[PDB]
Design a binder for this molecule. Structure first.
Ligand SMILES: *Cc1c(COP(=O)(O)O)cnc(C)c1O
Ligand SMILES: *Cc1c(COP(=O)(O)O)cnc(C)c1O
Lengths: 382, 382
């Protein structure tokens, strides 16, 4: 018999896609659109990393790499997690993947049996429920509130724990809210995992894009229950290179490497050598991160002041490069709100797919010049 | 609760891994081993491809690409499948993946429900059965015979079809036997798929590593039943670049792109632009394929002559860069034979994991000097 599997037919349809299509006709008819939709840095990847790629090419490093990643990168990763995050991990508890997205995918494929439950905190990054469902798991949503700065209340989370809970996904700094979770909240979540015996999946890819507070890694207190996911994408403007990394309990990391062996074999060899440079040349990487961080902070402050002057509400974000804006004054729901803004000349992402109803995600990984135009046009819509 | 999933615990062990252990300990305790284990070209990737990569780097092509691949590459792929293989496909029935291995992985995830059967022809590439079982499939094995040049008998295959058969996997040229299947057997196989309504998966990565005969793509006789898997890995010495591709029915391709979107997002952008060059610079790309093919043919003939002279039996291969050698004169079984050879100073791959019992896979993707060194050491295990 022919016909698709059930797992692939069970995939839900994005509101983002449909607003994006209308964005493309507008452009076809010559309409100038200001896009605040980016999920990646506007900066190009730093030259020290590009140069490392050039050396790897010239040195013929174009052959297959081990499934868990080249050993030198695994060693550098053990250093980075300890030095930057206070995580006590060995090179064998580290894995290189095809983007942080594959670390998450492999992780779920490795720990979920059909019916296993995963608590996700909304608003959430679009891929989490998807990856959980694709592996036969059940998504259990716990909401975080705008009045609470979108920071989870451990009390609301306790209520979602059942005997089938396998994992809890935490993402700080958060996409799409921009919230940075206080260390006390993270310690509280790590304690629930230990007390109830489940895994804590900590998605820390925005660790370096922080404006205020401190980035705390829950693996500091519960290393045997925590799977730390990270990568080079957001920090070093390496989204198109597809290199992510994770660390955690030895047996789970080994399983994750087995999944890679049967799927992608190993991430691109040239990209692994380029990432090694990003991790070992701390001086040049630090310079890049500080430059981007200052640029982002300026842009964020510029945006928030403008929204506030318009009377528009957004919880102030402390990290990442996103702002969740309430759309109530623009339309009855967020898709209608996004279509209206499109007509005004501004492309934003509807909050539907993230479970951020009545909101729209704005991204400030653009130039100030573009943020000024966008504010001018919101003005018109009001 | 914590713990690994059944799908991940289900994967069984490898005899390859165990002998590579012994081989590593000898490499360790001062031993000189000639390795005939390579599953990749010894040649480095051609300069024009490397030059395309540098250009993309210089141009800032380091951002997220669409899940099915950059549009320029999907189009070039359509030209390649239409021109080289006589396949009639649109760029939309085309997909770029992280190695041909991901194309196969995404394919099985997209078409198999737990219990669905997949027919594989032994000796087979080690990953086929792994990928099928990981998606919940049941592996149904149909043996090809040495006496028959490892070419399948359609009747034996026909005898394996049940109402649960979802696909049949065919790999020509073949890894590990080196057999190239005749157009007529390929047509007979396609016919069964059309006649019994199931998918025909054709792994054609070695198409350009052909010494005698002609490459036939069965997607030509059953376009709506065939998924053609290929990639730049073996043909352009780009194994470490992780770029594969497939074409076939639109609805299946679209489902494979959805699996990518939730796992790897898209393959590395730099590698996609470099592959476009391998595809469109036909003059430089053919010069390389022709240079490699010549070299392989020389090495094959030299290896075959040498074996014959030693009184060792092997079926003469027409494609790829492998030879399956009968180990009867060496040891009771292939693992034992591989261990004796290790002692004699030669590393080979036991046939065990490919279901090639009583055989050992030799690879001639090394220099003639190394092949000569190996033949010399073979004298010691008679
Ligand atoms: C970008 C991102 C990732 C991982 O991205 P990759 O491009 O796959 O490395 C994971 N989680 C969140 C919330 C992200 O924004
Ligand atoms: C090498 C190979 C592939 C695909 O390899 P990738 O490195 O993943 O492109 C597929 N089938 C066979 C038989 C192979 O030998």
């Amino acid at each position: 018999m022919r016909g698709l599997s059930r797992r692939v037919q069970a995939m839900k349809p994005s509101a983002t896609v449909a607003v994006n299509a209308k964005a493309l006709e507008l452009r076809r008819q010559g309409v100038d659109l200001v896009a605040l939709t980016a999920g990646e840095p506007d900066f190009d990847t730093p030259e020290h990393v590009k140069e490392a790629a050039r050396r790897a090419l010239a040195q013929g490093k174009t052959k297959y790499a081990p499934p868990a990643g080249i050993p030198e990168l695994r060693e550098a990763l053990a250093e980075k997690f300890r030095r930057e995050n206070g995580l006590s991990v060995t090179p064998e508890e580290t894995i290189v993947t095809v983007g942080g997205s594959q670390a998450l995918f492999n992780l779920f494929q490795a720990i979920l049996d059909p019916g296993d439950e995963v608590i996700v905190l909304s608003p959430y990054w679009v891929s989490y429920p998807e990856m959980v469902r694709f592996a036969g798991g059940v998504v259990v949503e716990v909401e975080t509130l705008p009045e609470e700065g979108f920071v989870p209340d451990p009390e609301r989370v306790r209520r979602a724990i059942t005997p089938r809970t396998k994992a809890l996904v935490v993402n700080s700094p958060n996409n799409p809210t921009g919230a940075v979770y206080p260390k006390e909240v993270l310690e509280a979540l790590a304690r629930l995992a230990v007390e109830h015996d489940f895994y804590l999946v900590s998605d820390e890819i925005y660790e370096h894009l922080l404006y205020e507070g401190e980035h705390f890694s829950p693996g500091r207190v519960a290393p045997e229950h925590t799977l730390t996911v990270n990568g080079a994408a957001k920090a070093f403007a390496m989204t198109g290179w597809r290199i992510g990394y994770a660390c955690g309990p030895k047996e789970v990391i080994k399983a994750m490497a087995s999944v890679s062996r049967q799927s992608t074999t190993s991430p691109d060899t040239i990209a692994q050598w380029a990432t090694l440079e990003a991790l070992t040349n701390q001086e040049a990487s630090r310079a890049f991160v500080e430059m981007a961080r200052e640029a982002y902070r300026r842009r964020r402050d510029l945006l928030l002041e403008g929204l506030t002057a318009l009377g528009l509400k957004a919880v102030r974000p402390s990290g990442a490069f996103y702002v969740l804006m309430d759309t109530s004054p623009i339309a009855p729901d967020e898709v209608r709100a996004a279509e209206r803004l499109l007509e005004a000349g501004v492309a934003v992402v509807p909050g539907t797919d993230f479970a951020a109803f009545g909101h729209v995600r704005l991204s400030y990984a653009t130039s100030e010049e573009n943020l000024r135009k966008a504010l001018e046009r919101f003005a018109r819509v009001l």
